[PDB]
Coordinates of all heavy atoms in Angstrom, one line a residue:
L1 N -2.7 17.3 -8.1 CA -4.1 17.0 -8.1 C -4.9 18.3 -8.2 O -5.9 18.4 -9.0 CB -4.5 16.4 -6.7 CG -4.1 14.9 -6.5 CD1 -4.1 14.5 -5.1 CD2 -5.0 14.1 -7.3
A2 N -4.5 19.4 -7.6 CA -5.3 20.6 -7.6 C -5.2 21.3 -9.0 O -6.2 21.8 -9.5 CB -4.9 21.6 -6.5
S3 N -4.0 21.3 -9.6 CA -3.9 22.0 -10.9 C -4.7 21.2 -11.9 O -5.5 21.8 -12.7 CB -2.5 22.1 -11.3 OG -1.8 20.9 -11.3
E4 N -4.7 19.9 -11.9 CA -5.5 19.1 -12.8 C -7.0 19.3 -12.5 O -7.8 19.4 -13.5 CB -5.1 17.6 -12.8 CG -3.7 17.4 -13.4 CD -3.6 18.1 -14.8 OE1 -4.3 17.7 -15.8 OE2 -2.8 19.1 -14.8
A5 N -7.4 19.3 -11.2 CA -8.8 19.5 -10.9 C -9.3 20.9 -11.4 O -10.4 21.0 -12.0 CB -9.0 19.4 -9.4
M6 N -8.5 21.9 -11.2 CA -8.8 23.3 -11.7 C -9.0 23.3 -13.2 O -9.9 24.0 -13.7 CB -7.8 24.3 -11.3 CG -7.8 24.7 -9.8 SD -9.3 25.5 -9.2 CE -8.9 27.2 -9.4
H7 N -8.2 22.6 -13.9 CA -8.3 22.6 -15.4 C -9.6 21.9 -15.8 O -10.2 22.4 -16.8 CB -7.1 21.9 -16.0 CG -7.3 21.6 -17.5 ND1 -7.1 22.5 -18.4 CD2 -7.7 20.4 -18.1 CE1 -7.4 22.0 -19.6 NE2 -7.7 20.7 -19.4
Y8 N -10.0 20.8 -15.2 CA -11.2 20.2 -15.7 C -12.4 20.9 -15.2 O -13.5 20.8 -15.8 CB -11.2 18.7 -15.2 CG -10.2 17.9 -16.1 CD1 -9.0 17.6 -15.6 CD2 -10.5 17.6 -17.4 CE1 -8.1 17.0 -16.4 CE2 -9.6 17.0 -18.2 CZ -8.4 16.6 -17.7 OH -7.5 16.0 -18.5
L9 N -12.3 21.8 -14.2 CA -13.3 22.8 -13.8 C -13.4 23.9 -14.8 O -14.3 24.7 -14.7 CB -13.0 23.3 -12.4 CG -13.6 22.7 -11.2 CD1 -13.5 21.2 -11.4 CD2 -12.9 23.1 -10.0
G10 N -12.5 24.0 -15.8 CA -12.5 25.1 -16.8 C -11.9 26.4 -16.3 O -12.3 27.4 -16.8
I11 N -11.0 26.3 -15.3 CA -10.4 27.5 -14.7 C -9.0 27.6 -15.1 O -8.2 26.6 -15.0 CB -10.6 27.4 -13.1 CG1 -12.0 27.2 -12.7 CG2 -10.0 28.6 -12.5 CD1 -12.3 27.2 -11.2
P12 N -8.5 28.7 -15.6 CA -7.1 28.8 -16.0 C -6.1 28.4 -14.9 O -6.3 28.9 -13.8 CB -7.0 30.3 -16.5 CG -8.4 30.7 -16.9 CD -9.3 29.9 -15.9
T13 N -5.1 27.6 -15.3 CA -4.2 27.1 -14.3 C -2.9 26.6 -14.9 O -2.9 26.3 -16.1 CB -4.9 26.0 -13.5 OG1 -4.0 25.4 -12.5 CG2 -5.4 24.9 -14.5
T14 N -1.9 26.5 -14.2 CA -0.7 25.7 -14.6 C -1.1 24.2 -14.6 O -2.1 23.8 -13.9 CB 0.5 25.9 -13.6 OG1 0.2 25.3 -12.3 CG2 0.8 27.4 -13.4
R15 N -0.4 23.4 -15.3 CA -0.7 22.0 -15.4 C 0.4 21.1 -14.8 O 1.6 21.6 -14.7 CB -0.9 21.6 -16.9 CG -2.0 22.4 -17.6 CD -3.4 22.0 -17.1 NE -3.7 20.6 -17.3 CZ -4.2 20.0 -18.4 NH1 -4.4 20.8 -19.5 NH2 -4.4 18.7 -18.5
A16 N 0.0 19.9 -14.5 CA 1.0 19.0 -13.9 C 1.3 17.8 -14.8 O 0.3 17.2 -15.3 CB 0.4 18.4 -12.5
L17 N 2.5 17.6 -15.1 CA 2.9 16.6 -16.1 C 3.5 15.3 -15.5 O 3.2 14.2 -16.1 CB 3.9 17.2 -17.2 CG 4.4 16.3 -18.3 CD1 3.3 15.7 -19.2 CD2 5.4 17.2 -19.1
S18 N 4.2 15.4 -14.4 CA 4.8 14.2 -13.9 C 5.2 14.5 -12.4 O 5.4 15.7 -12.0 CB 6.1 13.8 -14.6 OG 7.0 14.9 -14.7
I19 N 5.4 13.4 -11.7 CA 5.9 13.5 -10.3 C 7.0 12.4 -10.1 O 6.7 11.2 -10.5 CB 4.8 13.2 -9.3 CG1 3.8 14.3 -9.3 CG2 5.4 13.1 -7.8 CD1 2.6 14.1 -8.4
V20 N 8.1 12.7 -9.6 CA 9.1 11.7 -9.2 C 9.3 11.8 -7.7 O 9.2 12.9 -7.1 CB 10.5 11.9 -9.9 CG1 10.3 11.8 -11.4 CG2 11.1 13.2 -9.6
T21 N 9.6 10.6 -7.1 CA 9.9 10.6 -5.7 C 11.3 10.0 -5.6 O 11.9 9.6 -6.6 CB 8.9 9.7 -4.9 OG1 8.9 10.1 -3.5 CG2 9.2 8.2 -5.1
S22 N 11.9 10.0 -4.4 CA 13.3 9.6 -4.2 C 13.4 9.0 -2.8 O 12.5 9.1 -2.0 CB 14.3 10.7 -4.4 OG 14.1 11.7 -3.4
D23 N 14.6 8.5 -2.5 CA 15.0 8.1 -1.1 C 15.8 9.2 -0.4 O 16.3 8.9 0.6 CB 15.8 6.8 -1.2 CG 15.0 5.6 -1.7 OD1 13.8 5.6 -1.5 OD2 15.7 4.6 -2.2
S24 N 15.8 10.4 -1.0 CA 16.5 11.5 -0.5 C 15.7 12.2 0.6 O 14.5 12.5 0.4 CB 16.8 12.6 -1.6 OG 17.8 12.1 -2.4
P25 N 16.3 12.4 1.8 CA 15.6 13.0 2.9 C 15.5 14.5 2.8 O 16.4 15.2 2.6 CB 16.4 12.6 4.1 CG 17.8 12.5 3.6 CD 17.7 12.2 2.1
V26 N 14.2 15.0 3.0 CA 13.9 16.4 3.0 C 13.2 16.7 4.3 O 12.2 15.9 4.6 CB 13.1 16.8 1.8 CG1 12.7 18.3 1.9 CG2 14.0 16.6 0.5
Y27 N 13.6 17.7 5.0 CA 13.0 18.0 6.4 C 12.2 19.2 6.4 O 12.6 20.3 6.0 CB 14.2 18.1 7.3 CG 15.1 16.9 7.4 CD1 16.2 16.8 6.6 CD2 14.7 15.8 8.1 CE1 17.0 15.6 6.6 CE2 15.5 14.6 8.1 CZ 16.6 14.6 7.4 OH 17.4 13.4 7.4

């Protein structure tokens, strides 16, 4: 969200292309 928001603000940033989720537990 933030990287895409920064880009549409016209501020140089890395971009976000995809998100995957899983049933794998991370603590």
Side-chain angles (χ1 to χ4, degrees):
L1 286 162
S3 58
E4 288 317 289
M6 287 295 267
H7 167 79
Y8 287 101
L9 271 41
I11 304 183
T13 178
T14 71
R15 302 290 301 275
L17 178 58
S18 56
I19 298 177
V20 298
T21 204
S22 66
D23 295 335
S24 286
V26 175
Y27 301 95

